[PDB]
């Protein structure tokens, strides 16, 4: 199968530099042209740059002209994006994507990578503090209880959340993170359960933050 | 640059219905138009290029049409997997540009949220900060006004909210709103309230800090 795998994303200070890579397999890389496309969190797609048969043939979005350079190394089946003078507004998932070519014109992107996240910020990497959203033993919602975990003040994205190591999935809502004015992220994960279960069933949220190589498990006890 | 506009930004339809998505260009792009699909947490997928050529493995229920400045992506009968965001991309000239996207969501009946409010945990308060969390569980439609009141005073500028993607089983949304205050601010007031308004109904969930 055609595969495109991006790497090199991560945290960078404003004004800093980063190099993205994209490894191609399952087709003859040298027979295809390529583009980088990015997507800011919660926003739409934004084309970044394009490369033809070699580094001699490139094109750029106005917002990155002079700062980003697209290049390729066919011997390594790899596409690259050199990013200089980075700005907070460059924070996004960056996708490498293969182009359709016919009659000397490129016409669309038929295969995409899974993306790599670039964060531009002065904030420092930090694992989360996990606080309980404890259910009230007093049930005031028709026999149903809500409980959860508040995952606060981590950086950068992403975190993943499970409950009881994946054994509890029904009724779980894990919310998209928000970027706080502090520059750190926060999110909550909640689940609704039978209020009658609060005294018998243990509830543990499992919060994984790979950027800090930290996992936090928090037992949420009734109040 | 060639500007692309996708209107409406959201289509609310039922499975099995026909969907017509529009992309209009500020300049003549002839047939050099591509369409993409994107689901939450996934990379975009090519659906259509040269305006009307279906991409590899795309079901025949997808058909693209148009030329010049008006283009259409039609899904003859929506399947569950078709509820997603759709982007157009003009391939007429550099620099490439995208439309802003159209989200096709599942229309369902109105559903009032179950509303829960969580005081700050004692553990967090020890840190000198307080987060008050309001949860709107499984409601429809997505649009809702959520407001915080502290001792009945309307709050502004100290809360942030987040919303889930539409539920695959019941097609509802859920929403969290978080009020952030210092421990000292928190301990200066008693009544904490989260007010949710949809249509002609407001529902307020509250607690008293002491209790």
């Amino acid at each position: 199968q055609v595969q495109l795998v991006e790497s090199g994303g991560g945290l960078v200070k404003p004004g800093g530099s980063l190099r993205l890579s994209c490894a191609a397999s399952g087709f003859t890389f040298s027979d295809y042209y390529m583009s980088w496309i990015r997507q800011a969190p919660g926003k739409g797609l934004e084309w970044v740059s394009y490369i033809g048969s070699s580094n001699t043939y490139t094109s750029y979005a106005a917002s990155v002209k002079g700062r980003f350079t697209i290049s390729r190394d066919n011997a390594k089946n790899s596409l690259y994006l050199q990013m200089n003078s980075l700005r907070a507004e460059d924070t996004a998932v960056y996708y490498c994507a293969r182009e359709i070519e016919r009659s000397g014109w490129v016409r669309g992107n038929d295969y995409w990578g899974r993306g790599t996240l670039v964060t531009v910020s002065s904030a420092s990497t930090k694992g989360p503090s996990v606080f309980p959203l404890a259910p009230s033993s007093k049930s005031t919602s028709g026999g149903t209880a809500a409980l959860g975990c508040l995952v606060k003040d981590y950086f950068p994205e992403p975190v993943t959340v499970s409950w009881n190591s994946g054994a509890l999935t029904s009724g779980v809502h894990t919310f998209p993170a928000v970027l706080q004015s502090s520059g750190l992220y926060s999110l909550s994960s909640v689940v609704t359960v039978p209020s009658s279960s609060l005294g018998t069933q243990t509830y543990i949220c499992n919060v994984n933050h790979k950027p800090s190589n930290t996992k936090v498990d928090k037992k949420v006890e009734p109040k | 640059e060639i500007v692309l506009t996708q209107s409406p930004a959201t289509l609310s339809l039922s499975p099995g219905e026909r969907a017509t998505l529009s992309c209009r260009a500020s300049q003549n792009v002839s047939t050099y138009l591509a369409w993409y699909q994107q689901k939450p947490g996934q990379a975009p997928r090519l659906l259509m290029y040269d305006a009307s050529k279906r991409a590899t493995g795309i079901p025949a229920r997808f058909s693209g049409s148009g030329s010049g400045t008006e283009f259409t992506l039609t899904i003859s009968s929506l399947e569950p997997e078709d509820f997603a965001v759709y982007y157009c991309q003009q391939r007429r000239n550099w620099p490439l540009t995208f439309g802003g996207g159209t989200k096709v969501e599942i229309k369902r009946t109105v559903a009032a949220p179950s509303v829960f409010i969580f005081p700050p945990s004692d553990e967090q308060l020890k840190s000198g900060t307080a987060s008050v969390v309001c949860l709107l569980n499984n409601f429809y439609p997505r649009e809702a006004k959520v407001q915080w009141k502290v001792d009945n005073a309307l709050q502004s500028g100290n809360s942030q909210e987040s919303v889930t993607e539409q539920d695959s089983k019941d097609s509802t949304y859920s929403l969290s709103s978080t009020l952030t205050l210092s421990k000292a601010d928190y301990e200066k007031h008693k009544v904490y309230a989260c007010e949710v308004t949809q249509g002609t109904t407001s529902v307020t969930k509250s607690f008293n800090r002491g209790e």
Binding site: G52, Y57, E101, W105 | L96
Partner: peptide, 8 residues
């Protein structure tokens, strides 16, 4: 667009 990366 033109595959050499140059505007039409």
């Amino acid at each position: 667009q033109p595959a050499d990366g140059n505007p039409d």
